[PDB]
Amino acid sequence: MLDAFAKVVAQADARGEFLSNTQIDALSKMVKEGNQRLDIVNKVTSNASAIVTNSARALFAEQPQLIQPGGNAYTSRRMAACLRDMEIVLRYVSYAMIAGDSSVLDDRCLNGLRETYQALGTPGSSVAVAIQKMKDASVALANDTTGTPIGDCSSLVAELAGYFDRAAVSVV
Amino acid sequence: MLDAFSRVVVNSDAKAAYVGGSDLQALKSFIADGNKRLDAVNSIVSNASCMVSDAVSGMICENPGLISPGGNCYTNRRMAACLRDGEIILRYVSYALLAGDASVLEDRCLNGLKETYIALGVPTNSSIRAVSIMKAQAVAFITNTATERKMSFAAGDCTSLASEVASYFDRVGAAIS
Amino acid sequence: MKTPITEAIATADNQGRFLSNTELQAVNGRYQRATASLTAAKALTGSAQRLITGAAQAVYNKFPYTTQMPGPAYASSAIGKAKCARDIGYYLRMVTYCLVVGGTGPMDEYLVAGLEEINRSFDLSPSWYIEALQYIKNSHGLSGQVANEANAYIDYAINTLS
Amino acid sequence: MKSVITTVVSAADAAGRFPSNSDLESIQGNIQRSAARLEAAEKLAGNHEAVVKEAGDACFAKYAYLKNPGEAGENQEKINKCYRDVDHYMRLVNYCLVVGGTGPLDEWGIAGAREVYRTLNLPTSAYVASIAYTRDRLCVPRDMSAQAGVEFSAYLDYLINALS
Amino acid sequence: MKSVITTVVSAADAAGRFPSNSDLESIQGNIQRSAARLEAAEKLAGNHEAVVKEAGDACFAKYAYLKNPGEAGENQEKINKCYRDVDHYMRLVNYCLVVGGTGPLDEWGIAGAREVYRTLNLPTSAYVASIAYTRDRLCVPRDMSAQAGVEFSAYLDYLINALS
Amino acid sequence: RLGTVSGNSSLDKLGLDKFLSESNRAYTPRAQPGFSSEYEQIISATYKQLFGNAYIMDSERAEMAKQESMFRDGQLTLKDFCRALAKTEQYKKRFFDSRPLYGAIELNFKNILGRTPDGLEHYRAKSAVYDTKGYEAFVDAFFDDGEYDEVYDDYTVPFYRGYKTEANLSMAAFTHFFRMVRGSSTSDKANPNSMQKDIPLNYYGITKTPLAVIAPGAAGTAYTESFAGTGSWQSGRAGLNAARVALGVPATANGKSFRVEVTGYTQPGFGITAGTAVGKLYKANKLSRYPRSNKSYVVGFDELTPLYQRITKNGGTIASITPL
Amino acid sequence: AAKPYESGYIAEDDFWRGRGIAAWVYATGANKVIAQIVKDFNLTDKKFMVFIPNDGAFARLSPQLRKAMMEDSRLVYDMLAGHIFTSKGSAMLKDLQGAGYLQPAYGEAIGYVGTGRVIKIGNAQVIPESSDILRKNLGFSAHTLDTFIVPKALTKKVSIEAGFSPVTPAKYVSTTKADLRYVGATKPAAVGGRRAMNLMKQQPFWMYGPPYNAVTQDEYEPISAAAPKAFVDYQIFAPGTVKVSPDSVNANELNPVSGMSKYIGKTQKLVGDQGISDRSDKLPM
Numbered sequence A: 001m002l003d004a005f006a007k008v009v010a011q012a013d014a015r016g017e018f019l020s021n022t023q024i025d026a027l028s029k030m031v032k033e034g035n036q037r038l039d040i041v042n043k044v045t046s047n048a049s050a051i052v053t054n055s056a057r058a059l060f061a062e063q064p065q066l067i068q069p070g071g072n073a074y075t076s077r078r079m080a081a082c083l084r085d086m087e088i089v090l091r092y093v094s095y096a097m098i099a100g101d102s103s104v105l106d107d108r109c110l111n112g113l114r115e116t117y118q119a120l121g122t123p124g125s126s127v128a129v130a131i132q133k134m135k136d137a138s139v140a141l142a143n144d145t146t147g148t149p150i151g152d153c154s155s156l157v158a159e160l161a162g163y164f165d166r167a168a169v170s171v172v
Numbered sequence B: 001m002l003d004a005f006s007r008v009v010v011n012s013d014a015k016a017a018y019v020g021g022s023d024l025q026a027l028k029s030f031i032a033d034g035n036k037r038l039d040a041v042n043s044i045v046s047n048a049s050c051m052v053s054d055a056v057s058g059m060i061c062e063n064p065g066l067i068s069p070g071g072n073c074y075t076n077r078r079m080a081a082c083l084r085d086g087e088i089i090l091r092y093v094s095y096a097l098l099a100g101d102a103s104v105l106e107d108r109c110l111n112g113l114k115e116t117y118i119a120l121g122v123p124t125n126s127s128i129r130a131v132s133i134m135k136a137q138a139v140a141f142i143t144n145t146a147t148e149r150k151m152s153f154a155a156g157d158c159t160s161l162a163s164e165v166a167s168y169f170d171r172v173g174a175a176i177s
Numbered sequence C: 001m002k003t004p005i006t007e008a009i010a011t012a013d014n015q016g017r018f019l020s021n022t023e024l025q026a027v028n029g030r031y032q033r034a035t036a037s038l039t040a041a042k043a044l045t046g047s048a049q050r051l052i053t054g055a056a057q058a059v060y061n062k063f064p065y066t067t068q069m070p071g072p073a074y075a076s077s078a079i080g081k082a083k084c085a086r087d088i089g090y091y092l093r094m095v096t097y098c099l100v101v102g103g104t105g106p107m108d109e110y111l112v113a114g115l116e117e118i119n120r121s122f123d124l125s126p127s128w129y130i131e132a133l134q135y136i137k138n139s140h141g142l143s144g145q146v147a148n149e150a151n152a153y154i155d156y157a158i159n160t161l162s
Numbered sequence D, E: 001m002k003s004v005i006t007t008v009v010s011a012a013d014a015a016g017r018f019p020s021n022s023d024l025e026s027i028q029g030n031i032q033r034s035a036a037r038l039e040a041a042e043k044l045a046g047n048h049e050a051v052v053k054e055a056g057d058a059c060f061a062k063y064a065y066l067k068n069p070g071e072a073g074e075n076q077e078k079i080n081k082c083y084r085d086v087d088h089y090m091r092l093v094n095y096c097l098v099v100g101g102t103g104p105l106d107e108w109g110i111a112g113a114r115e116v117y118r119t120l121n122l123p124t125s126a127y128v129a130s131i132a133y134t135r136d137r138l139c140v141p142r143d144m145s146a147q148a149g150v151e152f153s154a155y156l157d158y159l160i161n162a163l164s
Numbered sequence F: 001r002l003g004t005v006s007g008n009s010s011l012d013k014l015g016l017d018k019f020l021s022e023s024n025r026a027y028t029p030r031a032q033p034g035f036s037s038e039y040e041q042i043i044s045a046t047y048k049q050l051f052g053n054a055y056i057m058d059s060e061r062a063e064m065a066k067q068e069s070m071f072r073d074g075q076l077t078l079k080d081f082c083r084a085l086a087k088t089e090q091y092k093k094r095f096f097d098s099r100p101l102y103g104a105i106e107l108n109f110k111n112i113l114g115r116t117p118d119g120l121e122h123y124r125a126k127s128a129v130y131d132t133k134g135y136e137a138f139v140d141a142f143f144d145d146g147e148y149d150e151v152y153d154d155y156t157v158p159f160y161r162g163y164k165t166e167a168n169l170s171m172a173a174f175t176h177f178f179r180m181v182r183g184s185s186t187s188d189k190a191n192p193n194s195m196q197k198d199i200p201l202n203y204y205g206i207t208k209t210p211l212a213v214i215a216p217g218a219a220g221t222a223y224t225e226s227f228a229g230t231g232s233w234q235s236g237r238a239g240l241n242a243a244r245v246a247l248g249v250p251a252t253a254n255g256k257s258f259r260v261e262v263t264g265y266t267q268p269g270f271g272i273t274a275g276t277a278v279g280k281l282y283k284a285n286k287l288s289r290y291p292r293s294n295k296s297y298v299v300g301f302d303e304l305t306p307l308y309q310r311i312t313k314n315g316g317t318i319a320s321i322t323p324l
Numbered sequence G: 001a002a003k004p005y006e007s008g009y010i011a012e013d014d015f016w017r018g019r020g021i022a023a024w025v026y027a028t029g030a031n032k033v034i035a036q037i038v039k040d041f042n043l044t045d046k047k048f049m050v051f052i053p054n055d056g057a058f059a060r061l062s063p064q065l066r067k068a069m070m071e072d073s074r075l076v077y078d079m080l081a082g083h084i085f086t087s088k089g090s091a092m093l094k095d096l097q098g099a100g101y102l103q104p105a106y107g108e109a110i111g112y113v114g115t116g117r118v119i120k121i122g123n124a125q126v127i128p129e130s131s132d133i134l135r136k137n138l139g140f141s142a143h144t145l146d147t148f149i150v151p152k153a154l155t156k157k158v159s160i161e162a163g164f165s166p167v168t169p170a171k172y173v174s175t176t177k178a179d180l181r182y183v184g185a186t187k188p189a190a191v192g193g194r195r196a197m198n199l200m201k202q203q204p205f206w207m208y209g210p211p212y213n214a215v216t217q218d219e220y221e222p223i224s225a226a227a228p229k230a231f232v233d234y235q236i237f238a239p240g241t242v243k244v245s246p247d248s249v250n251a252n253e254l255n256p257v258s259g260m261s262k263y264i265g266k267t268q269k270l271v272g273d274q275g276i277s278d279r280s281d282k283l284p285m
């Protein structure tokens, strides 16, 4: 895997170039955010059990056929594996948020997830609804203050929303 | 193949939602900035022959082992195919700029282009540099910063269209890698 | 690639857990040191050609047989001289990559993995590249903690060569 | 989707050419016509639950035989699926005014419909009587403007001619 | 004969469908963009005898070696056929403005040209160099209107990319 | 775009998006004298179909200038032009003279008929025409059996139909179609399973065994495997590809079995450490950790989630999962 | 420095401010360089020719090139020395005809193509509407370009892959009351209370139907299970105080010909609204 600092280095080694003066000034801004990025990863991780469970609770209220006999989440092994997957996706979205690059997200979670759910019969349109419910529980948790100093984080919540949309289109 | 308007339709169809209110304003903005998009697609297809020849020549000038015996662009059959491999890639990028969505570039061009280039034996580092040269040419004609041509436009800013077409060219390098 | 960011992800993904404050502090310390490292990399980039021409000449002064002996391994001809100023620029570029990333990652993936195999095969001496690196440690002109970050990756490559 | 963009791109892809001056001239028609057909798509998306339910019982006001035994409006589930299937069709007309062509109606509503409404024995003249009621309910200055009602009714009788 | 009308009628025929609402919208763009190009073609009509004379001198100025014995511009008779062959290209772009697309260039001027010129030993770069001159002496608010110059330039670059 | 959901479509995002959009139907018996643009499009469309999206240069396209002119007034395009172009040297050089007989036989099924050979008897009926009468009648049996006038109007271009259900083929022929047609930016010179020299469906087209379909543009789209016998009688060798059967006690202990295909295995990235290992780089015996990339596994269901993590954490790319 | 309108505009340093085609040479410090160029190559005696790029040529200059003209003052020197030509002296536009070459002040014999009224100097084009101005004293000719004469021998060091590839930041677009609903689902259900089912959104009206059976939010409330033993008697009140009111006095709105009734029967759950509720009013209890 490689983060956002290692991303521009790998793009520059393949050209055989030193980094520019403009490119160092663009990596100073990524360090200048710095603490605001670590606030989003702190808020998402600290409420990780309640984000997964209460957005599984709201999925079975709107699609109650998934827990009927003959549904894809009806049994204890088949329900516990469903909550386990929703915690796997929230894990690698927080990994992609601390790194600034969606490379650990697809190389270790997403590549082969569509092929897995097509061999098992898991409804892929219902997985993306569970992904989109953890999204707006987390982008509403991102832009509340709650012991953070007041400022503008609207550029880092568009990046966190883009990692949830990436995980949702790799399964739908 | 989806355009910009039919992309928000397949996003609304996934949740049985009508298109209206919040989503129609981002599409009314597409119509209001729509004269710029036709005025920018015209700038690329008016120079589409000089763009391709200068991209394959500049790929060769920096890496002159490609025209040696053992290089991929050695003979005349191979050089004429490399001049045509890039003329199609530029054609599909100008479709995605006209549509406003990268679905025609991914469906008809990039899906399968990777295993095309590993069966033939095309060097992916050299083909990325030929795309990179076309990216610099496309932003220069859109933002009128071309050092060899001065196209006439109305006055205004089109940075969002140049940052859009730059993201289409980076999908070409990420696919074949 | 070894980075303070990616080594925190890899030690939590190996255990299979979320990023705790054990991992949020290892990337907090990368952000404190990043200001010294980014000024050390902007200065080594802007004075690269001075440091490349000087370090190659500093090897021809200590080892003058490398500009004398015939053969392909030595910098006798103009072709072996051009392949030496290319080797110094590879060692210098990996140092500025390690300062930008924040760890000894880009020079592991690109330079020091397989380094003892390509030196013994093409018959290059690691003592040539040490003296080329002792010059850059003595001539970058950096000061304080800016020089502490630059000399930490220069001294890392001298330990693999020796 | 069949649209204005996807027609002129596919025509210039089968010929293997760049977007010509006549392919940019068609997207200018998509600009001057978008004002009327987005007014109809916004008027429909705000008042859709009242338009669907007004047309859902215009089926059963013309065909009261559908509550007879064995028919398609026997029980509560079958009228829930009937008001759903009308609301599906009104969503696709909202999708066609947004895109600008008959794309979403063709691929999602019309293709395969003759083989389903005959296998499941749903009378296709009653999936029409709700669509034909909405086309004559529209008052041309009251709900929308003049050219917004031209676009709204032209997608409404494309669906009628495709079920007939 | 690629036009805006010809592209949608041939695409409605390829799928066996009637002219839809996605097809009449493309004819609307032919109406709006018509006033731009139809007065550029009026400008090219009454002032073609001086535009090809100015463009004719602009290729023998660049390639002065054509007047050598053994080249394509030896005598007055071979010179007269070059001012004729550039007056044809100015008539075929006068046709492309009133049609609305690259039809009359693609049939009578471009298709078959690169094997006629190769066999008859005529350099295509000099058939280029007079087309790129009238693209360059055109300044947009004097010679025509601001939008007529966009259409007039759009066909000259289409002719240039075809020869080159 | 990939997937099956989000658009209510599976075949256009399986590589068939360009092919599901054209007719190219030649609506008039002769080309009109005066105009060339309509019929130049049909000739470029029947070059792209019959040659399988190959590059025909201008010095090679002039070698078929005669037929192109017989078609423009006095020949059909389905018959008598695709038949004339298949007897040319440009078709014969790259589709017949390069491969064995059964390799040339299924390239003609794709190019002329738009499908694949179903079983051995589809191969065997076409090799018998070549053994008795030569190449000139061998390409006529693709045109002059019953199938060709049945499925194509004799003024349209052929199209691909080996995936459809109205082309009454076996379901192993569906999986074989997506081995020979990989999207619209590919030819059979640009196919990794036939590189204009191989037999693309050699064991699989004869025995009618189905393959796992990998979509073009997927993550593990570069997956290819070799072929080797395994038994003592045929003098085979063990340990190259995983089996396709799941026979014994391990088939149903740990639940239902699957067959997983991995693509990219490199030397950097094995350990739990985010970076390469510095030092010796190779053990004594000098071999890699994975001597082949493109490995395959047969795994149970209770071992599928530990294996999934063991693949991706070590650099691999899952190409396909298929229940045995 | 001073005002340009002093001494008329007859001063040489103030004349190009007056003939306002090149305003970038005084907005930047470019006019110090071309005065230092003609010191350095002694052009003050012999006649020469300058090709000044206009305003608009400086504006169409690329951001990967305009950065490299700031971090390298040597690159600004020979680019401005690449516009001063000493081949033909004070040459007018009629002497720039045909095809040929031109010798710069520093750089090297840049080729020109001059065909009648269009004249190119190699990635540049002379606008001939204002280009034949000649100064008598310190004598040169000055012509106006529309692009800088950029030789390709200088700019192999520049590219767009340095970091000048333009990128726009994409925004999210959520509404403030759109989530304030969604923060209550982040807490666990022992401390979030009723608010733990806040993530369910409004389904369409047929999704609560008897095939699908989507569960409403109010069930997750105790207001669904309000089933008491006690009951109001309604006869112990005064007559005129018990009020009742029907929904509509119509046979056809209470029940249509189909069963899609909003008021009678089990089809009262098939409303397009009333799927979600306001239970972020109270507490996290």
Ligand SMILES: *CC[C@H]1/C(=C/c2[nH]c(/C=C3N=C(/C=C4\NC(=O)C(CC)=C4C)C(C)=C\3CCC(=O)O)c(CCC(=O)O)c2C)NC(=O)[C@@H]1C
Pocket (backbone or CB within 6 Å): A066, A072, A073, A077, A078, A079, A081, A082, A083, A085, A086, A088, A108, A109, A110, A113, A116, A120, A122, A123, A126, A127, A130, F301, F304, F305, F306, F308, F309
């Ligand atoms: C609410 C979630 C939806 C859902 C999920 C569901 N998933 C499975 C089974 C598996 N999922 C995986 C995927 C992964 N496993 C991993 O370890 C990782 C990390 C890299 C990923 C991405 C695997 C391997 C399995 C099978 C093994 C198992 O866990 O039992 C199941 C069970 C399917 C079954 O038949 O048992 C469910 C139910 N299904 C839904 O209905 C929801 C929409």
Ligand SMILES: *CC[C@H]1/C(=C/c2[nH]c(/C=C3N=C(/C=C4\NC(=O)C(CC)=C4C)C(C)=C\3CCC(=O)O)c(CCC(=O)O)c2C)NC(=O)[C@@H]1C
Pocket (backbone or CB within 6 Å): F231, F232, F233, F234, F247, F248, F249
């Ligand atoms: C008289 C029998 C016929 C015959 C048998 C034959 N079989 C093999 C090889 C294999 N058979 C199996 C089948 C199984 N293996 C199992 O463990 C189970 C339990 C579920 C079954 C059903 C397998 C997997 C093999 C291959 C592995 C192996 O060789 O041991 C062979 C050897 C084949 C060879 O060429 O070496 C023979 C001879 N063959 C005949 O001719 C008889 C008709």
Ligand SMILES: *CC[C@H]1/C(=C/c2[nH]c(/C=C3N=C(/C=C4\NC(=O)C(CC)=C4C)C(C)=C\3CCC(=O)O)c(CCC(=O)O)c2C)NC(=O)[C@@H]1C
Pocket (backbone or CB within 6 Å): F265, F266, F267, F268, F286, F287, F288, F289, F290, F291, F292, F293
């Ligand atoms: C000068 C040679 C050309 C070249 C070689 C090159 N090869 C690799 C990588 C691998 N090679 C193998 C092959 C084997 N491994 C084995 O153990 C055996 C005996 C069974 C063989 C035949 C394998 C498995 C790899 C990948 C794993 C590894 O790194 O060892 C590479 C590295 C490519 C990479 O990105 O890792 C190179 C560069 N390349 C050239 O350019 C030369 C023409």
Ligand SMILES: *C[C@@H](*)[C@H]1/C(=C/c2[nH]c(/C=C3N=C(/C=C4\NC(=O)C(CC)=C4C)C(C)=C\3CCC(=O)O)c(CCC(=O)O)c2C)NC(=O)[C@@H]1C
Pocket (backbone or CB within 6 Å): C056, C059, C066, C067, C072, C073, C074, C075, C076, C079, C080, C081, C083, C084, C085, C087, C090, C110, C111, C118, C122, C124, C128, C132
């Ligand atoms: C001061 C220089 C001394 C010297 C240098 C010299 N080196 C070579 C050849 C090679 N050097 C490398 C090293 C690297 N390549 C890399 O890609 C990287 C990481 C980015 C490193 C560290 C390699 C692989 C070679 C051989 C391959 C090649 O030819 O490029 C040579 C040429 C030797 C030859 O046999 O061709 C010289 C002369 N030698 C001296 O005399 C100086 C003291």
Ligand SMILES: *[C@@H](C)[C@H]1/C(=C/C2=NC(=C\c3[nH]c(C[C@H]4NC(=O)C(C=C)=C4C)c(C)c3CCC(=O)O)/C(CCC(=O)O)=C2C)NC(=O)[C@@H]1C
Pocket (backbone or CB within 6 Å): B047, B050, B051, B054, B055, B057, B058, B059, B060, B061, B062, B132, B133, B136, B137, B140, B141, B145, B146, B147, B148, B149, G062, G123, G152, G156, G158, G159, G160, G161
């Ligand atoms: C076609 C003639 C257009 C035109 C195209 C542009 N090219 C631009 C940049 C560019 N060109 C090259 C190739 C060139 N450089 C070389 O070193 C060699 C030989 C080995 C050649 C042929 C390169 C490498 C680049 C830079 C790509 C990059 O940045 O990575 C360009 C950008 C700006 C400009 O020049 O104005 C354009 C527009 N330019 C023209 O004038 C005509 C119309």
Ligand SMILES: *[C@@H](C)[C@H]1/C(=C/C2=NC(=C\c3[nH]c(C[C@H]4NC(=O)C(C=C)=C4C)c(C)c3CCC(=O)O)/C(CCC(=O)O)=C2C)NC(=O)[C@@H]1C
Pocket (backbone or CB within 6 Å): D059, D066, D071, D072, D073, D078, D079, D081, D082, D083, D085, D086, D088, D089, D108, D109, D116, D120, D122, D123, D126, D127, D130
């Ligand atoms: C009321 C107008 C009718 C009536 C209608 C019924 N239609 C029924 C089912 C049905 N409708 C469709 C098409 C619909 N589904 C879609 O996904 C889309 C487009 C996105 C559309 C237009 C389908 C495919 C089906 C069958 C699947 C299903 O059960 O929903 C229906 C149910 C049939 C049944 O119960 O067996 C009814 C009752 N009923 C009437 O009385 C008049 C005729």
Ligand SMILES: *[C@@H](C)[C@H]1/C(=C/C2=NC(=C\c3[nH]c(C[C@H]4NC(=O)C(C=C)=C4C)c(C)c3CCC(=O)O)/C(CCC(=O)O)=C2C)NC(=O)[C@@H]1C
Pocket (backbone or CB within 6 Å): E043, E044, E047, E050, E051, E054, E134, E136, E137, E138, E139, E140, E142, E143, E144, G117, G128, G129
């Ligand atoms: C725009 C680049 C300049 C400008 C140029 C001038 N053009 C002059 C004369 C002229 N130009 C043309 C070609 C052009 N005008 C047309 O009507 C058409 C075709 C429809 C074209 C291509 C012609 C035929 C003529 C002669 C007739 C005339 O306009 O007088 C001109 C006068 C000097 C000369 O060239 O003889 C100038 C200065 N004028 C401008 O204001 C901008 C800067």
Ligand SMILES: *[C@H](C)[C@H]1/C(=C/C2=NC(=C\c3[nH]c(C[C@H]4NC(=O)C(C=C)=C4C)c(C)c3CCC(=O)O)/C(CCC(=O)O)=C2C)NC(=O)[C@@H]1C
Pocket (backbone or CB within 6 Å): A034, A035, A036, A038, A039, A040, A042, A142, A143, A144, A145, A148, A149, A150, A151, A152, A153, A156, C024, C025, C028
């Ligand atoms: C954005 C989504 C938030 C928000 C973020 C801000 N945080 C700011 C400063 C700040 N944050 C932290 C905590 C963080 N740093 C760490 O080292 C660790 C754990 C290891 C964490 C969780 C600290 C320590 C600081 C102090 C640094 C400083 O004050 O600069 C901050 C800057 C305030 C400002 O400049 O206005 C912002 C904007 N604030 C918000 O309102 C939204 C909700």
Ligand SMILES: *[C@H](C)[C@H]1/C(=C/C2=NC(=C\c3[nH]c(C[C@H]4NC(=O)C(C=C)=C4C)c(C)c3CCC(=O)O)/C(CCC(=O)O)=C2C)NC(=O)[C@@H]1C
Pocket (backbone or CB within 6 Å): B056, B066, B072, B073, B077, B078, B079, B081, B082, B083, B085, B086, B088, B089, B108, B109, B113, B116, B120, B122, B123, B126, B127, B130, F053, F054, F055, F056, F184, F185, F186, F187, F188, F189, F190
């Ligand atoms: C030039 C930038 C490259 C390079 C290019 C070559 N491509 C060659 C053949 C080839 N390319 C494609 C893909 C192309 N065809 C399409 O239809 C589409 C998109 C829809 C694309 C991008 C195909 C399918 C083929 C095979 C042609 C055939 O089978 O006839 C090629 C020829 C190789 C050869 O002749 O052996 C070259 C040289 N190669 C380079 O070195 C630079 C980097």
Ligand SMILES: *[C@H](C)[C@H]1/C(=C/C2=NC(=C\c3[nH]c(C[C@H]4NC(=O)C(C=C)=C4C)c(C)c3CCC(=O)O)/C(CCC(=O)O)=C2C)NC(=O)[C@@H]1C
Pocket (backbone or CB within 6 Å): D043, D044, D045, D047, D050, D051, D054, D134, D137, D138, D139, D140, D142, D143
């Ligand atoms: C025009 C012919 C008459 C006229 C007719 C009336 N329409 C009445 C109500 C009404 N009409 C519609 C359909 C229309 N409105 C929409 O929003 C849409 C599509 C989005 C359409 C096609 C609806 C849905 C309704 C009910 C809601 C309402 O307007 O109250 C109406 C009132 C009586 C009735 O309930 O039908 C009349 C009289 N009105 C006129 O003034 C001209 C003469």
Ligand SMILES: *[C@H](C)[C@H]1/C(=C/C2=NC(=C\c3[nH]c(C[C@H]4NC(=O)C(C=C)=C4C)c(C)c3CCC(=O)O)/C(CCC(=O)O)=C2C)NC(=O)[C@@H]1C
Pocket (backbone or CB within 6 Å): G221, G222, G223, G224
């Ligand atoms: C009745 C004499 C009052 C009155 C009562 C209403 N209460 C409504 C909802 C409600 N009530 C409570 C308190 C109750 N629940 C408990 O768990 C406990 C003790 C631990 C008590 C005392 C709660 C928490 C709630 C909200 C939860 C729910 O709705 O199930 C209510 C419905 C309000 C509405 O939604 O319209 C009514 C009418 N109101 C009166 O007018 C008399 C004075």
Ligand SMILES: C=CC1=C(C)[C@@H](Cc2[nH]c(/C=C3N=C(/C=C4\NC(=O)[C@H](C)[C@H]4CC)C(C)=C\3CCC(=O)O)c(CCC(=O)O)c2C)NC1=O
Pocket (backbone or CB within 6 Å): B032, B033, B034, B035, B036, B038, B039, B040, B142, B143, B144, B153, B154, B155, B156, B157, B158, B159, B161, D028, E033, E147, E150
């Ligand atoms: C009618 C069909 C049609 C064409 C023939 C072409 C031509 C064209 N371009 C623009 C108009 C424009 N074109 C651009 C584009 C640019 N300007 C720049 O300064 C950049 C260099 C470049 C890309 C960012 C801008 C900024 C406008 C102004 C109008 C707007 O902002 O929408 C207009 C609108 C001007 C008007 O209203 O008259 C037209 C007709 N485009 C079309 O839509």
Ligand SMILES: C=CC1=C(C)[C@@H](Cc2[nH]c(/C=C3N=C(/C=C4\NC(=O)[C@H](C)[C@H]4CC)C(C)=C\3CCC(=O)O)c(CCC(=O)O)c2C)NC1=O
Pocket (backbone or CB within 6 Å): E059, E066, E071, E072, E073, E078, E079, E081, E082, E083, E085, E086, E088, E089, E108, E109, E116, E120, E122, E123, E126, E127, E130
């Ligand atoms: C209606 C559409 C139409 C056209 C577009 C042209 C195209 C065209 N031009 C020429 C023909 C020509 N083109 C040139 C041109 C040149 N020679 C030079 O010295 C310069 C290189 C260049 C000046 C522009 C000459 C000299 C001929 C005559 C060839 C000859 O005499 O051998 C011919 C051959 C027949 C002939 O005219 O003799 C044709 C078909 N003619 C058409 O009928």
